[PDB]
């Protein structure tokens, strides 16, 4: 099955383009982001561990994100044609793990927001859902950890050749015709 990555930094719009691309794909959508959450939601002294973690913008250790996405990737394995694997990898060492593990992605997608438009989506969605590490102390801490550590995953999958860029400052389904370029494409 085709494996595809989605990256881009905090509220640049992944998640938004995902759900877009399986709508339209039938693509199996998997966020580490969400799985973590459902850990947490457990109430598992683990979950504990990983709201501690998530709720200061921090990095969850690959070990265990890796687990939960190879573990998601299992379960839907009897009905998936493809799969969108959306917050990961986020540094280099999770891509090489997880192509040592799992395989090699077919793409990544990169969704490219600006640093100012990051942080005006999330401080709004704070406002709105309230998720606990929408805050604006937790955003920016979020965000440099994704210019040190994810910015050269994508510059990994530039040497592969894989990489293609989605200008996600435009509206979202201006996006999804860049996206949808992209896949139609592969
Ligand atoms: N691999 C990993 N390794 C280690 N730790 C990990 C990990 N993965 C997760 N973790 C841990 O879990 C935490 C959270 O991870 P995660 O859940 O992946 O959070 P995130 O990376 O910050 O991504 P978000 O869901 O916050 O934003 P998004 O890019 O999907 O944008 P969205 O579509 O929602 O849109 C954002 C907002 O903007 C809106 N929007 C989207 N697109 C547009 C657009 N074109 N125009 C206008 N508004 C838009 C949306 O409606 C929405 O309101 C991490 O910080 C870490 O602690």
Redesign the pocket.
């Known amino acids: 099955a085709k494996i595809i990555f989605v990256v ?1 930094g ?7 383009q995902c759900e877009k691309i399986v709508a339209k794909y039938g693509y199996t959508h998997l ?4 799985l ?1 959450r459902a850990e947490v939601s457990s109430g598992s002294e683990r979950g504990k561990q990983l709201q501690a ?2 709720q200061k ?4 250790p690959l070990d265990t ?1 890796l687990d939960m996405i190879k573990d998601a990737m299992i379960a839907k394995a009897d009905v998936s044609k493809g799969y969108l694997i959306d ?4 540094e280099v060492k ?1 891509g090489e793990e997880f192509e040592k593990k799992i395989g090699k992605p077919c793409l990544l997608l990169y ?1 490219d927001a600006k640093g100012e438009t990051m942080v005006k ?2 401080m ?2 704070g406002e709105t859902s309230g998720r606990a ?1 929408d805050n604006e102390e937790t955003i920016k801490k ?1 965000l440099d950890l994704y210019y040190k550590a994810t910015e050269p995953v994508i510059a990994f999958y530039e040497g592969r050749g894989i990489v293609r860029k989605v200008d ?1 400052e ?3 389904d201006e ?1 999804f015709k860049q996206v949808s370029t992209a896949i139609d494409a592969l």
């Open positions: 881009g905090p509220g640049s719009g992944k998640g938004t966020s580490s982001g969400d973590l973690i998530m913008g921090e990095l969850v994100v917050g990961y990898p986020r999770q969704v989506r999330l709004k969605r590490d979020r996600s435009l509206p979202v996006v």
